[PDB]
């Protein structure tokens, strides 16, 4: 009894003493998929359980390195060599034993690479989509943009909310993906719209802002405002350590984005894995499908 009650009582005190219209249950019952059990996944999962989230699933294909524990808050020195996802889940249960904490050793197929095992990466694709479909919120916490593409597409197709966290040396980006219903941009919209080791504090800031964006986003929106009982629900949060600054930004979905373009959505809906395997090995095929190819060849004819 005191097991579950302790965390939940703390949050009930918060609600009834400070924010009576705060919806704690929507947060507690949110099923969270964490793609990446590194520095971001570890700090995000800690903020989530402090908010009472009961079900958290880690996805990771790595093992604990000797230098991981000092930055990745769920691992100890004695954990070197162990697979991350299952260990992260077990570490969460040591903090709060009533957790529905699960770890899945799974490689997210990366765009821009030749397939090393078609049958196995096909199976990984199926497992990734099933995991995304069964959860409510998906956190994209992998360090590479080539690992973000497939989860972004699958979460959009499965109509799930995505929260991206990405780190620079002294800066961080937190952003939520637009959904299909005036659609917000995704992680990949910007670099095609605007073509051209980290300080330890970056990941702690990005993780907590990502979770606090989620909890606000889960509250009902006030009519006539893009605010909730917890405050704003910005599209993007960009922060900088060198000047201790934070900026809110918003971006529309870009019609020729190689991730959320309606043609990319349509081609996936038609072919699924058959389309994905082609996009993974030939990213230029993606820009043809999305229409970005015509844009780039047009930027040439204007600049020559």
């Amino acid at each position: 009894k005191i097991a579950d009650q302790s965390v939940d009582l703390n949050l009930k005190l918060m609600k009834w003493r400070i924010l009576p219209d705060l919806n704690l249950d929507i947060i507690k019952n949110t099923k969270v998929l964490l793609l990446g059990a590194g520095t971001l996944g570890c700090y995000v999962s800690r903020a989530l359980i402090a908010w009472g989230v009961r079900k958290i699933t880690f996805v990771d294909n790595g093992t604990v390195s000797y230098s991981n524990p000092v930055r990745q808050a769920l691992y100890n020195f004695e954990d070197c060599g162990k697979p991350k996802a299952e260990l992260a889940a077990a570490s969460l249960k040591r903090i709060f034993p009533l957790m529905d904490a699960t770890g899945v050793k799974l490689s997210i197929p990366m765009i821009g690479h030749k397939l090393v095992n078609e049958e196995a990466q096909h199976k990984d694709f199926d497992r990734l989509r099933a995991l995304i479909k069964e959860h409510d919120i998906i956190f994209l916490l992998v360090d590479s943009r080539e690992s973000r593409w497939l989860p972004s597409l699958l979460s959009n197709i499965e109509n799930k909310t995505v929260i991206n966290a990405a780190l620079g040396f002294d800066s961080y980006l937190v952003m939520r993906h637009g959904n299909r219903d005036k659609q917000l941009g995704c992680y990949f919209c910007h670099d095609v719209v605007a073509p051209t080791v980290t300080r330890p504090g970056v990941a702690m800031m990005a993780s907590s802002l990502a979770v606090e964006l989620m909890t606000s986003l889960l509250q009902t929106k006030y009519s006539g405002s893009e605010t909730t009982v917890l405050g704003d629900i910005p599209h993007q949060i960009r922060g900088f350590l060198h000047n201790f600054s934070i900026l809110k930004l918003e971006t529309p979905a870009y019609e020729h984005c190689p991730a959320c373009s309606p043609k990319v959505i349509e081609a996936f809906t038609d072919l699924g894995w058959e389309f994905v395997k082609k996009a993974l090995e030939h990213p230029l095929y993606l820009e043809e499908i999305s229409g970005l190819s015509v844009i780039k060849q047009e930027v040439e004819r204007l600049g020559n």
Binding site: V193, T251, G303
Partner: protein
Amino acid sequence: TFKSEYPFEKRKAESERIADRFPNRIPVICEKAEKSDIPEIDKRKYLVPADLTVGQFVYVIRKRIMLPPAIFIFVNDTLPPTAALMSAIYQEHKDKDGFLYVTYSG
């Protein structure tokens, strides 16, 4: 400047012609700010596709003057967002002669 060289009758005539030969393109005049010190552009009349973004139009200017990495674009004394489509800006900041006039400065 462009408007100084040509009178309105000539400007609005060529612009109405561009709408015939290129229905899905926006006529853009781009000139350097008379105060800032960026390399003066060689080409000033641009027929950009309607779905081109500001940031993509920033990219073509940066390479048109071989400017290594800052570039800012201005339309009617405001800085439009990078995600804006040139068609939307052309709909709002269009000139009576049918041209969208933009300015770039350091």
